[PDB]
């Protein structure tokens, strides 16, 4: 083996297998999921129980794990369900369910403390003395790709100042229509950074892929995009997961590249096939059967050990272990 088990191809789950391994090796998220109060839940409809089941199978089973119950759990069963939705939406569906389950518990707020960050969106008038500052929260960042060669340029475009001129003048209310500037700057960055690479455009009638080259570094410094940086905790991040899609004319195959321990020892998770791969194969070779990298996961250097805690078999409560083994007994008969 390789110490990591795979997920079986069970229907049009698309990116679901890639996302599940990404959350599984978000080790701190995993231990929080194991300790959720899911005793007395209905197996046929419980997303927190389903995520516990798949994580447990991904930790103990020596054969690839099935995801049928989980697919039934959040009800994506229409023929186009997975291709119409986004990786972000599926991650939101799962993470909201788990975070909602953890409310009132000792591990409550684990999802916000791992993935959510603070951001300010501003609109500043240039001739009149008015400004509008509102705080936003984010769990994921959608990055522009066309015309941007690497993540640094991609982030510069995100913080680039937008202009609101005539025919788009901001409604300043008391000050009337105004020629303002609109922008967004980063207040804080989460310990686990979910970056979606928006490589598509929509002529014909379809959304096509932007197969352009786009570079992402193994180590991503982001202090300069913070409004005020913090010494002793620079916004330094380490690449963790690279979610890839392979691109013949219709096709579509979703695999994820991971260094689960953050040590730069990378593996390719092709569903049930988990294999070792070079760091060149995971990073440089995915810059762009046209394969394209569409989602990246970074972990802050200061938080790397805590986010990637060791997870032992005893971290799983005994009553959780008892219920899952009982289910496997029922299937074996």
């Amino acid at each position: 083996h390789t110490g990591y088990v795979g997920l079986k191809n069970q229907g049009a789950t698309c990116y679901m297998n890639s996302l599940l391994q990404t959350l599984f090796f978000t080790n701190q998220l995993r231990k929080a999921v194991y300790m959720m109060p899911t005793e007395g839940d209905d197996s046929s409809k419980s997303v927190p129980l389903a995520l516990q089941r798949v994580f447990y199978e991904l930790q103990h089973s020596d054969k690839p794990v099935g995801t049928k119950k989980l697919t039934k759990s959040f009800g994506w069963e229409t023929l186009d369900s997975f291709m119409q939705h986004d990786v972000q939406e599926l991650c939101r569906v799962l993470l909201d369910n788990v975070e909602n389950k953890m409310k009132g518990t000792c591990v409550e707020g684990t999802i916000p403390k791992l993935f959510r960050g603070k951001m300010v969106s501003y609109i500043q008038c240039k001739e009149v003395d008015y400004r509008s500052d509102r705080r936003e929260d984010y769990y994921d960042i959608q990055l522009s790709i066309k015309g941007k060669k690497n993540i640094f340029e991609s982030f510069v475009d995100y913080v680039a100042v937008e202009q609101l001129d005539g025919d788009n003048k901001y409604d300043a209310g008391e000050h009337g229509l105004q020629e303002a500037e609109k922008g967004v700057k980063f207040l804080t960055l989460p310990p686990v950074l979910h970056l979606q690479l928006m490589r598509f455009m929509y002529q014909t009638d379809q959304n096509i892929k932007i197969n352009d080259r786009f570079e992402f570094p193994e180590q991503l410094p982001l202090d300069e995009f913070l409004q005020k940086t913090d010494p002793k905790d620079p916004a330094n991040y380490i690449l963790h997961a690279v979610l890839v899609h392979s691109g013949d004319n219709h096709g579509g195959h979703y695999v994820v590249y991971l260094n689960p321990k953050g040590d730069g020892k990378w593996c390719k998770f092709d569903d049930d096939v988990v294999s070792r791969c070079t760091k060149e194969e995971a990073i440089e070779h995915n810059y762009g059967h046209c394969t394209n990298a569409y989602m990246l996961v970074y972990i802050r250097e200061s938080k790397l050990s805590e986010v990637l805690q060791a997870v032992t078999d005893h971290d799983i409560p005994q009553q959780l272990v008892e219920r899952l083994q009982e289910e496997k007994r029922i299937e074996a008969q």
Partner: peptide, 13 residues
């Protein structure tokens, strides 16, 4: 996103 090519405009919103 990211399931291309497709004619769905719910991707990225």
């Amino acid at each position: 996103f990211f399931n291309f090519p497709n004619x769905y405009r719910r991707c990225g919103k």
